[PDB]
Amino acid sequence: ISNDIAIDLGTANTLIYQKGKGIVLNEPSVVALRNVGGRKVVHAVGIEAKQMLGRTPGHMEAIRPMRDGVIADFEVAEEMIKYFIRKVHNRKGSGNPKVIVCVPSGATAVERRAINDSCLNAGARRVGLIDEPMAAAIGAGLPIHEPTGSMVVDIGGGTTEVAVLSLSGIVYSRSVRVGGDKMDEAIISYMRRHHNLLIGETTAERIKKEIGTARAPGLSIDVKGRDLMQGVPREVRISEKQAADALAEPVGQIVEAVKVALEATPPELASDIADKGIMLTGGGALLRGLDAEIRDHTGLPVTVADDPLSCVALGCGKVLEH
């Protein structure tokens, strides 16, 4: 019975894998703060804090401290990490926990140090950082030990991370700020301009899951929100075609991120990727039809990982057990 853990500290979701157990926590990367006096106190972290997005009283706020793939607020990110690490601690298990945290290719020395220290301050005795695209690839079942290159396209909340891997190493990696959040924001902007309806970010994500698609058909759902000009609540019906229209720009920007990475690939790795194609991971990979859009624009096979939301945690989990 161990307290050793591997953490996927995602822009939108945090997962923890505990040695010998598997994934024991999976909660939004959100912290709610309450203004008391002139200071901010931690009010909630995780599932309850996400529920407060768009619903806070004046003296509270809900923050995603990793929202854009960078640490926006070190103290709030460290409180978020300490909360989750503390939450899964098993008093029956051994002390001196070894903690592995996944780190995106773009993370700075400053951010890596800050994650290291947050884990120490949360009780870790030793901290190891592992490259996130290696984690994604492993959890997606890619044979990353083989010499032939693999390309993984990991579409998260605040970023899409693209990497080419070979012989247990990363050869190329690029990050762009397009992913699940820009898809939500596109649906917000669509509803405003086309239906004069102002919607919250949690509603926008729901619309994306229920009817979002990367290609036109279709079916319809009710969407409720705030009237633009006059401010009273009302509702309108929106279709799959309309959702496709709304998502077309951020979908195109993901496709372009994939093309840019491909265009950097040297000849022998290009031959490797032209064979095996591209593996999609992250929750953004669940967008209906995104795989076909990428296939159509690249000419390459596109596969969606099993369980795309958990690939990174599963992969670093495997590393922790070995």
Ligand X SMILES: N=C(N)SCc1ccc(Cl)cc1
Which residues are at the interface with ligand ADP (CB under 6 A)? Answer: 10-13, 156-158, 180-181, 205, 208-209, 212, 282-284, 286-287, 309
Judged by CB, which is closer to ligand ADP: 258, or 269?
258
9 binds, among Mg ion, ligand X, ligand ADP, none (CB under 5 to 8 A by kind): ligand X
Judged by CB, which is closer to ligand X: 110, or 219?
110
CB of 152 to ligand ADP, least distance (A): 12
Contact call for residue 104 and ligand X (CB under 6 A): yes
Judged by CB, which is closer to ligand ADP: 60, or 286?
286
- Grouping H, G, I as helix, E, B as strand and the rest as coil, residue 113 is helix
Phi, then psi, of 163 in degrees rounded to 5:
-145, 150
DSSP-assigned letters across all residues of 41-81:
EEEEETHHHHHHTT---TTEEEE-TTTTSS-S-HHHHHHHH
Judged by CB, which is closer to ligand X: 103, or 309?
103
From residue 107, alpha-carbon distances to 13, 301, 304 in Å are 17, 30, 25
Contact call for residue 115 and ligand X (CB under 6 A): yes
The residue numbers preceding gaps of C to N over 2.5 A in the chain are 217
Judged by CB, which is closer to ligand X: 71, or 258?
71
Report how far residue 25's alpha carbon sits from residue 111's, in angstroms, rounded to the nearest whole number: 23
Locate 36 and state its tokens. 């008391």
Question: What residues numbered 53-82 form the site for ligand X, per CB under 6 A?
Answer: 66, 69, 71
DSSP state of 105: T
CB of 152 to Mg ion, least distance (A): 11
Judged by CB, which is closer to ligand X: 137, or 199?
137
122: left (phi over 0), alpha (psi -120 to 50) or beta: alpha
Window of 5-13, 33-41, 87-95, 236-244 that interacts with ligand X by CB under 6 A: 5-13
Judged by CB, which is closer to ligand X: 10, or 212?
10
Contact call for residue 318 and ligand X (CB under 6 A): no
Report how far residue 147's alpha carbon sits from residue 30's, in angstroms, rounded to the nearest whole number: 39
Report how far residue 176's alpha carbon sits from residue 105's, in angstroms, rounded to the nearest whole number: 11
Question: What residues numbered 132-151 form the site for ligand X, per CB under 6 A?
Answer: 132
DSSP-assigned letters across all residues of 162-225:
EEEEETTEEEEEEEES-SHHHHHHHHHHHHHHHH-EE--HHHHHHHHHHH-BSS----EEEEEE
Judged by CB, which is closer to ligand X: 81, or 199?
81
Among 28, 139, 156, 180, binds Mg ion (CB under 5 A): 156
Contact call for residue 9 and ligand X (CB under 6 A): yes
Site string for ligand X, 152-191 (x = CB under 6 A): ----x-----------------------------------
Contact call for residue 315 and Mg ion (CB under 5 A): no
DSSP state of 27: E
Report how far residue 253's alpha carbon sits from residue 275's, in angstroms, rounded to the nearest whole number: 24
- Grouping H, G, I as helix, E, B as strand and the rest as coil, residue 152 is strand
Using CB under 6 A as the criterion, which residues of the chain lie in contact with ligand X when the complex forms?
Answer: 9-11, 66, 69, 71, 102-104, 107, 111-112, 115, 132, 156
Q: Which residues bind Mg ion (CB under 5 A)?
A: 10, 156
